[PDB]
């Protein structure tokens, strides 16, 4: 009665509310186009089956694996071949082939309506049926983010509830909601980006990469913990993210809860910053641990030169246990460098490995590997200069212009990429500056590079969907640690052919005057990308000037009596003269 029914076990432990939540998320992520009602009935059916099994675990089919049961359920969906031309071919297969097929078919750019707040109608729908309202939130977010961290989404759904709980009762109801919903959306976009990076590391580089990344990060966050505790947490967390990215949202949640329990049981040994996190409820606790502030450096951190540089038997220790020795190094170097980005630590660790590989084949390895730490100095200075440079730009020109700079920089790197994707990436990269440049200067490098990694991964995911550029492919697939430097190193692609001019691309009309500011920016930034594509060798200062002229023209005509006549008269001349400005 314990080995028998996995679905009963999961139902019992997780409980009905979370069980149904996670199954809704999983179904919304696998079948992103189906209507809400379809998914709700699937969820209810599955829950019913779980409760029957919980009664009699020896009943028929209660023995079957979670994947088999979820996959079967997905395969009983109305109009599958019509809605999803491919996922039905997946339904011909058994597990685990079927699940791999499903995962293959997930869509990272489903191209759905933007989630626009409607305070009146939303509060109404929230009041008449809260469960249906929060379920809809889960569904809408889950399908817009098919790799979103399942329990994390349940946590955000609870924050969404709290927003509507405090705001709907009175007043504008929109001046209460809109800023809170805007903050929630930014947290959603961030959270998705982090989880997608973890899943992408699994997909593209494997579990050893995910472990290394986790070792680095957790060592930084918990420098007091010893290598055994870090290793344990990393093994557990890796398994957690493996199951979540693999689709096992139930295993995902259950192992995530166990890990939080363990961490809070050993918080004294792990970190002083976990106190607050451990006093909170389940979901909130996991959240808090995931985002916990880094603990203060221990006063008894060991000197590393003696064991990792000066020791004469390093080649023996390395040849004996490559993985273990390298892991120890990474733990030790990371815990004492919260001022480094995770990817920087991974590069340093690769350099350490490469130095040992080289030195241990030569006559006198000792004298060779004695200056290993000194090989880290260039790797450190490069990103520090970049961050310093870009923050100097950000603080001079502000987000918009900084974004414009990045949109130019990346369009020259990859002019074959679609204007929407370039705009999206450029704007995300620009937001990095707003997030990181204001922080204490010690935190600017880690903040900047870690968020850059998220944005570049987003670009790499879109590029997997729609491959256009071999340079992007190489940078996206060669080395996870080297991705940001690889991208930074790209110059203008001179094999590119300037896109043939099309006046309507740069032609504006009065409609733009009604848009909110950000959608107006996006229109202008799209034009900018198109300018670069047409004139790849134009300097960023030329493009900045031309875009200024375009911006001024838009502002004038939007303020005009006959806005449309203003556009009709002015636009064509600006369009013609721009070409000449961009030679
Ligand atoms: Cu049993
Ligand atoms: Cu149990
Ligand atoms: Cu599995
Ligand atoms: Cu969170
Ligand atoms: Cu030794
Ligand atoms: Cu017009
Ligand atoms: Na790997
Ligand atoms: Na276009």
UniProtKB/Swiss-Prot annotation:
<keyword id="KW-0597">Phosphoprotein</keyword>
<feature type="disulfide bond">
    <location>
        <begin position="475"/>
        <end position="486"/>
    </location>
</feature>
<feature type="binding site">
    <location>
        <position position="248"/>
    </location>
    <ligand>
        <name>Ca(2+) 1</name>
    </ligand>
</feature>
<dbReference type="GO" id="GO:0072732">
    <property type="term" value="P:cellular response to calcium ion starvation"/>
</dbReference>
<dbReference type="GO" id="GO:0003677">
    <property type="term" value="F:DNA binding"/>
</dbReference>
<feature type="modified residue" description="Phosphoserine">
    <location>
        <position position="58"/>
    </location>
</feature>
<feature type="disulfide bond">
    <location>
        <begin position="513"/>
        <end position="558"/>
    </location>
</feature>
<keyword id="KW-0165">Cleavage on pair of basic residues</keyword>
<feature type="disulfide bond">
    <location>
        <begin position="90"/>
        <end position="101"/>
    </location>
</feature>
<comment type="similarity">
    <text>Belongs to the ALB/AFP/VDB family.</text>
</comment>
<feature type="disulfide bond">
    <location>
        <begin position="436"/>
        <end position="447"/>
    </location>
</feature>
<feature type="modified residue" description="Phosphothreonine">
    <location>
        <position position="419"/>
    </location>
</feature>
<feature type="modified residue" description="Phosphoserine">
    <location>
        <position position="5"/>
    </location>
</feature>
<comment type="subunit">
    <text>Interacts with FCGRT; this interaction regulates ALB homeostasis. Interacts with TASOR. In plasma, occurs in a covalently-linked complex with chromophore-bound alpha-1-microglobulin; this interaction does not prevent fatty acid binding to ALB.</text>
</comment>
<keyword id="KW-0488">Methylation</keyword>
<dbReference type="InterPro" id="IPR021177">
    <property type="entry name" value="Serum_albumin/AFP/Afamin"/>
</dbReference>
<dbReference type="GO" id="GO:0051902">
    <property type="term" value="P:negative regulation of mitochondrial depolarization"/>
</dbReference>
<keyword id="KW-0020">Allergen</keyword>
<keyword id="KW-0479">Metal-binding</keyword>
<dbReference type="GO" id="GO:1903981">
    <property type="term" value="F:enterobactin binding"/>
</dbReference>
<feature type="disulfide bond">
    <location>
        <begin position="167"/>
        <end position="176"/>
    </location>
</feature>
<keyword id="KW-0186">Copper</keyword>
<feature type="binding site">
    <location>
        <position position="254"/>
    </location>
    <ligand>
        <name>Ca(2+) 2</name>
    </ligand>
</feature>
<dbReference type="GO" id="GO:0015643">
    <property type="term" value="F:toxic substance binding"/>
</dbReference>
<dbReference type="GO" id="GO:0005504">
    <property type="term" value="F:fatty acid binding"/>
</dbReference>
<feature type="binding site">
    <location>
        <position position="246"/>
    </location>
    <ligand>
        <name>Zn(2+)</name>
    </ligand>
</feature>
<feature type="binding site">
    <location>
        <position position="243"/>
    </location>
    <ligand>
        <name>Ca(2+) 1</name>
    </ligand>
</feature>
<feature type="modified residue" description="Phosphothreonine">
    <location>
        <position position="421"/>
    </location>
</feature>
<feature type="disulfide bond">
    <location>
        <begin position="359"/>
        <end position="368"/>
    </location>
</feature>
<dbReference type="GO" id="GO:0005615">
    <property type="term" value="C:extracellular space"/>
</dbReference>
<comment type="function">
    <text>Binds water, Ca(2+), Na(+), K(+), fatty acids, hormones, bilirubin and drugs. Its main function is the regulation of the colloidal osmotic pressure of blood. Major zinc transporter in plasma, typically binds about 80% of all plasma zinc. Major calcium and magnesium transporter in plasma, binds approximately 45% of circulating calcium and magnesium in plasma. Potentially has more than two calcium-binding sites and might additionally bind calcium in a non-specific manner.</text>
</comment>
<keyword id="KW-0964">Secreted</keyword>
<keyword id="KW-0862">Zinc</keyword>
<feature type="modified residue" description="N6-succinyllysine">
    <location>
        <position position="563"/>
    </location>
</feature>
<feature type="binding site">
    <location>
        <position position="258"/>
    </location>
    <ligand>
        <name>Ca(2+) 2</name>
    </ligand>
</feature>
<feature type="disulfide bond">
    <location>
        <begin position="199"/>
        <end position="245"/>
    </location>
</feature>
<feature type="binding site">
    <location>
        <position position="248"/>
    </location>
    <ligand>
        <name>Zn(2+)</name>
    </ligand>
</feature>
<feature type="disulfide bond">
    <location>
        <begin position="460"/>
        <end position="476"/>
    </location>
</feature>
<keyword id="KW-0732">Signal</keyword>
<dbReference type="InterPro" id="IPR020858">
    <property type="entry name" value="Serum_albumin-like"/>
</dbReference>
<dbReference type="GO" id="GO:0046872">
    <property type="term" value="F:metal ion binding"/>
</dbReference>
<feature type="modified residue" description="Phosphothreonine">
    <location>
        <position position="545"/>
    </location>
</feature>
């Amino acid at each position: 009665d314990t080995h028998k029914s996995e679905i009963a076990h999961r139902f019992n432990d997780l409980g009905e509310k979370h069980f149904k939540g996670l199954v809704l998320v999983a179904f919304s992520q696998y079948l992103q186009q189906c209507p809400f009602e379809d998914h709700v009935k699937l969820v209810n059916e599955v829950t019913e089956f779980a409760k029957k099994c919980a009664a009699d675990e020896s009943a028929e089919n209660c023995d079957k694996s979670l994947h088999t049961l979820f996959g079967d359920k997905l395969c009983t969906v109305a109009t599958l071949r019509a809605t999803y031309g491919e996922l039905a071919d997946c339904c011909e297969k058994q597990e685990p082939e079927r699940n791999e097929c499903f995962l293959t078919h997930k869509d990272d750019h489903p191209n759905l309506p933007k989630l626009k707040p409607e305070p009146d109608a939303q509060c109404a729908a929230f009041q008449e049926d809260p469960d249906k309202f929060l379920g809809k939130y889960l569904y809408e977010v889950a399908r817009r983010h098919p790799y979103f961290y399942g329990p994390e989404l349940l946590f955000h759904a609870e924050e969404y509830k709290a927003d509507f709980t405090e705001c709907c009762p009175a007043d504008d109801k929109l001046a209460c909601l809109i800023p809170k919903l805007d903050a929630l959306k930014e947290r959603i976009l961030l959270s998705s980006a982090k989880e997608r990076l973890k899943c992408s590391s699994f997909q593209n580089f494997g579990e050893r990469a995910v472990k290394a990344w986790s070792v680095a990060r957790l060592s930084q966050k918990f420098p007091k913990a010893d290598f055994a505790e870090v290793s344990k947490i990393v093994t557990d967390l890796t398994k957690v993210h493996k199951e979540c990215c693999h689709g096992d949202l139930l295993e995902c949640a259950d192992d995530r809860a166990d890990l939080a329990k363990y961490i809070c049981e050993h918080q004294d040994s792990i970190s002083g910053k976990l106190k607050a996190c451990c006093d909170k409820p389940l979901l909130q606790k996991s959240h808090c641990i995931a985002e916990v502030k880094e603990d203060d450096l221990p006063s008894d951190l060991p000197a590393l030169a003696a064991d990792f540089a000066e020791d004469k038997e390093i080649c023996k220790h390395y040849k004996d246990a490559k993985d273990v020795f390298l892991g120890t190094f990474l733990y030790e170097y990371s815990r004492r460098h919260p001022d480094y980005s995770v990817s920087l630590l991974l590069r340093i660790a690769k350099t350490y490995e490469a130095t040992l590989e080289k030195c241990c084949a030569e006559a006198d390895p000792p004298a060779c590997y004695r200056t290993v730490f000194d090989q880290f100095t260039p790797l450190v200075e490069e990103p520090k200069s970049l961050v310093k440079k870009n923050c100097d730009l950000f603080e001079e020109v502000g987000e918009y212009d900084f974004q414009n700079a990045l949109i130019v920089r990346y369009t020259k790197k990859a002019p074959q990429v679609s204007t929407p994707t370039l705009v999206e990436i450029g704007r995300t990269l620009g937001k990095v500056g707003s997030r990181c440049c204001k922080l204490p200067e010690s935190e600017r490098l880690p903040c900047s590079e870690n968020h850059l990694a998220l944005a570049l991964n987003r670009l790499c995911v879109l590029h997997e969907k729609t491959p256009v550029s071999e340079k992007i492919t190489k940078c996206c697939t060669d080395s996870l640690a080297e991705r940001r430097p690889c991208f930074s190193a790209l110059e203008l692609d001179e094999g590119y052919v300037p896109k043939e001019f099309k006046a309507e691309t740069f032609t504006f009309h009065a409609d733009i005057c009604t848009l909110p500011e950000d959608e107006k920016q996006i229109k202008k930034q799209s034009a900018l990308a198109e300018l670069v594509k047409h004139k790849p060798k134009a300097t960023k200062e030329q493009l900045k000037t031309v875009l200024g002229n375009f911006s001024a023209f838009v502002a004038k005509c939007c303020g005009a009596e006959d806005k449309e006549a203003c556009f009709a008269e002015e636009g064509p001349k600006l369009v013609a003269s721009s070409q000449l400005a961009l030679a």
